[PDB]
Amino acid sequence: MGRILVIEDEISLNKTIIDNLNEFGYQTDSSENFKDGEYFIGIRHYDLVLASWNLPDGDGAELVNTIKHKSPRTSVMIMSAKADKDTEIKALKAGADDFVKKPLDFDILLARIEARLRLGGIEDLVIDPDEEKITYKGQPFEVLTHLARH
Amino acid sequence: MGRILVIEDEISLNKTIIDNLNEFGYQTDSSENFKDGEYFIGIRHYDLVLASWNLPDGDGAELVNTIKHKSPRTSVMIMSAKADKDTEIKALKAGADDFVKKPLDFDILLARIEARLRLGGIEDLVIDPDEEKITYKGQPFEVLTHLARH
């Protein structure tokens, strides 16, 4: 049960996506605009965050470069009410953590986002999830983690 | 310039994908069968490895469970000469590192696999790429790496 944030201009449509999101218990904030979502990013902590395109605050590629204020202010995931082929390709170039599309079958996205095996990555542990500073001061991998815990 | 291994039953058809692979200098071995590719996995070292389905040695879901001999013998990437909707969904459930599909536009896959921003992850460095044991015995992130190198 992760958390997936919302970046959308339509509260009805963002609730429709929030269906798929909280289908895995994803914490959400109903966005009435792209800016609404980009601030919902900062208001709370989340495991994955949508982004938009061609919204009232979505300036397309200009929004693409804008939303990554210096180092990207999260917004790892993306959303789209269409296939957004060019947008989808560009986001994949950006290596987004996830993404959602309306024409895509929602059962398929349910199975995917619900479980897609998307794995990758104490005395000295200085992990800071709030500031994205996962770190152990000092740092068979499971054995290594067990030794670190003890 | 990485390496992408091949798992396919047709040498010409797999050479078609090998085009996209060596388009980024991906080392390849022409596979005339699923077993051909699964052994090409072991013959050399690679950055990414296709897998198959419904091949002469592709037993579908049975091949899916078979190819992961105990801990998966690489084969992170997958390939398909069709949309393989069920197969694609299942592989995504497996959290594959990569994949290729024939109906998918090859320019799109060129742009993706060429550059999709897929990054993620000395005195004591005990990294073993040959045996997948990336580790530093002792172990700002760039600063940390610089300090470790010195």
Neighbours of A64 (CB within 10 A): 19
Q: Which residues of A touch B140 (CB under 8 A)?
A: 133, 135
Closest by alpha carbon to B113, among B14, B22, B6?
B22
Cα–Cα distance between A139 and A20 in angstroms, integer? Answer: 37
Residues 113-132 of A with CB under 8 A from B: 115-121
- Note whether A53 and A60 are within 8 A (CB): yes
- Backbone discontinuities in chain B, residue before each (C to N > 2.5 A): 121, 139
Cα within 13 Å of Cα(A103), Cβ side: 5
Instruction: Read off φ and ψ for residue B136, nearest 5 degrees.
Output: -115, 125
**Residue A114: how many CB atoms within 10 A of its CB?**
14
> CB–CB of B121 and A119 under 8 A?
no
| φ, ψ for residue A40, nearest 5 deg | -55, -25
Backbone dihedral angles phi then psi of residue B107, each to the nearest 5 degrees: -65, -40
Q: Give the number of other Cβ atoms within 10 Å of residue B81's Cβ.
A: 19
Which of chain A's residues have a Cβ under 8 Å away from the Cβ of B119? Answer: 95
- For B115, what's the count of Cα atoms within 13 Å in the CB-facing half-sphere? 3
Domain A4-114 is found in CATH 3.40.50.2300: yes
- A120 to B118: CB separation less than 8 angstroms, yes or no: no
* A93 contacts B115? CB cut-off 8 A: yes
Distance separating alpha carbons of residues A49 and A96, to the nearest angstrom? 10
Listed by start position, the domains of chain B span 4-114, 122-150
Counted across chains A and B, CB pairs separated by less than 8 A come out at 45
| Resolution attained, angstroms | 3.8
Mutate to test the interface with A, among B76, B88, B92 (most CBs of A within 10 A): B92
Give, in degrees to the nearest 5, the angle at Cα A49 between A129 and A46.
35
Backbone angles phi, psi at B49, to 5 degrees: -140, 120
Q: Do A115 and B133 touch (CB under 8 A)?
A: no
Long-range contacts of A30-37 (CB under 8 A, 24+ apart): A30/A6, A31/A6, A31/A7, A33/A8, A33/A9, A33/A57, A34/A7, A34/A8, A34/A9, A34/A58, A34/A63, A34/A67, A36/A7, A36/A8, A36/A9, A37/A5, A37/A6, A37/A7, A37/A8, A37/A75
CB A51 within 8 A of CB A7: yes
Q: For residue A149, which amino acid is it? A: R
Helix pair A106-114, A11-22: axis angle to 10 deg? 50
Distances (CA, A) of A95 to B10, B63, B114, B142: 31, 29, 12, 20
Of A117, A133, A141, the CB nearest to B94: A117
Contact A128, A143 (CB under 8 A): no
